[PDB]
């Protein structure tokens, strides 16, 4: 029961994370790169600073990782292996976290209501800042779900142990990377 509810959360929240990044990319990022609206000079061609490597992060979850978590739906005790397998991909959260401070300032100092305007326009409940915190949230949440699985998975649980190891190592490295 408990291992199953946790696995269902893992997957349900993964789907929503992919929905959320996708939304972010097809609204806030798209308007900037589209050429369909007035881009403050202060942010022009600086979408790499705003959105960091979130495209790549999205591609990873949307092309690979969600497809692979789904395969472990009936195998919660093994799902730690999913993370070991894809450990190198998570290093791209290190890059993203390094860049988030610069991203945030740039949006204060130079975007005015640009993004508030698009938010209003599309009817989005989440501000660009709310979307852009999500990778930082998500990368610290995986370790919580693995711990929860450990509280309810038997001697078959070094296939969580090492997954958890990775998902503790990634955020700490991202945390250790900040200036």
């Amino acid at each position: 029961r408990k291992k199953e509810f946790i696995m269902a959360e893992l997957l349900q929240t993964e789907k929503a994370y992919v929905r959320d990044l996708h939304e972010c990319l097809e609204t806030y990022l798209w308007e900037m790169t589209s050429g369909v609206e007035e881009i403050p000079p202060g942010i022009l061609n600086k979408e790499h600073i705003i959105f960091g490597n979130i495209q790549e992060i999205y591609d990873f979850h949307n092309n690979i990782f969600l497809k692979e978590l789904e395969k472990y739906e009936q195998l919660p005790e093994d799902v730690g292996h999913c993370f070991v397998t894809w450990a190198d991909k998570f290093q791209m959260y290190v890059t993203y976290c390094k860049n988030k401070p610069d991203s945030n300032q740039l949006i204060l100092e130079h975007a005015g209501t640009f993004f508030d305007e698009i938010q209003q326009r599309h009817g989005l409940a989440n501000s660009i800042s709310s979307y852009l915190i999500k990778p930082v949230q998500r990368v610290t949440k995986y370790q919580l779900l693995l711990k929860e699985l450990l509280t309810c998975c038997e001697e078959g649980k070094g296939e969580l142990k090492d997954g958890l190891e990775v998902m503790l190592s990634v955020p700490k490295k991202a945390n250790d990377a900040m200036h």
Partner: protein, 177 residues
């Protein structure tokens, strides 16, 4: 219409995620406590003044000193939480939570939130604490902590019974208006 960003901080043992879920669903989740509460916003009227309340969880970030602050800028009000049956969490208000919140957001209102009031009068909890030469955190302790940190209100609540829960968020909003 006024938007409000609210960030909820504190130790893992406060039940941050549970608090928010229980507040937003009007129900303790019960069976399974989800570990994920995604950034939320909803309209609420306060003193008949409708408001868009935005809630951000921070659970999972409790060991990443440089990552937690990424959520801090442009926050309108903080809930700093401790559990009423964890003296350590309470002490961490002083030692961990208030410092970094002030450092980054020196003029943002703080509500001091005491959680798990449903456990302060619980024999097994109280006994488990007596065995560590400890007691639960009582009301004057929270009031004295609030004062020390500059909190606008010290408030007690339970996600379990929902006692004081709606009120926590009512006053988060009143602290901004």
């Amino acid at each position: 219409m006024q938007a409000i960003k609210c960030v909820v901080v504190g130790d893992g043992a406060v039940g941050k995620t549970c608090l928010l879920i229980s507040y937003t669903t009007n129900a303790f989740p019960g069976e399974y406590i989800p570990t994920v509460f995604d950034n939320y916003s909803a309209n609420v009227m306060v003193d008949g003044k409708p408001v868009n309340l935005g809630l951000w969880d921070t659970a999972g970030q409790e060991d990443y000193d440089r990552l937690r602050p990424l959520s801090y800028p442009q926050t309108d009000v903080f809930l700093i939480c401790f559990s009423l049956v964890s003296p350590a969490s309470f002490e961490n208000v002083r030692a961990k939570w208030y410092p970094e919140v002030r450092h980054h957001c020196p003029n943002t209102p703080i509500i001091l939130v005491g959680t798990k009031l449903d456990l302060r009068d619980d024999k097994d909890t109280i006994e488990k604490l007596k065995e560590k030469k400890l007691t639960p955190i009582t009301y004057p302790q929270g009031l004295a902590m609030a004062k020390e940190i500059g909190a606008v209100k010290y408030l007690e609540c339970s996600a379990l019974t929902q006692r004081g829960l709606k009120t926590v968020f009512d006053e988060a909003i009143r602290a901004v208006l």
